[PDB]
Amino acid sequence: SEERRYKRCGQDEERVRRECKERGERQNCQYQIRKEGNCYVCEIRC
Secondary structure (H helix, E strand, O other): OOOOEOOOOOOOEEEHHHHHHHHHHHOEEEEEEEEEEEEEEEEEEO
């Protein structure tokens, strides 16, 4: 029911992916990397 998206235009893909995984795993919430334009987006589903 709840979806969080963190758009990270000030970061490269490698960092976004790394920190999205960290963020999901730390919280036991599901994580996925999306794109908006050329910016990578961390999506968290708890």
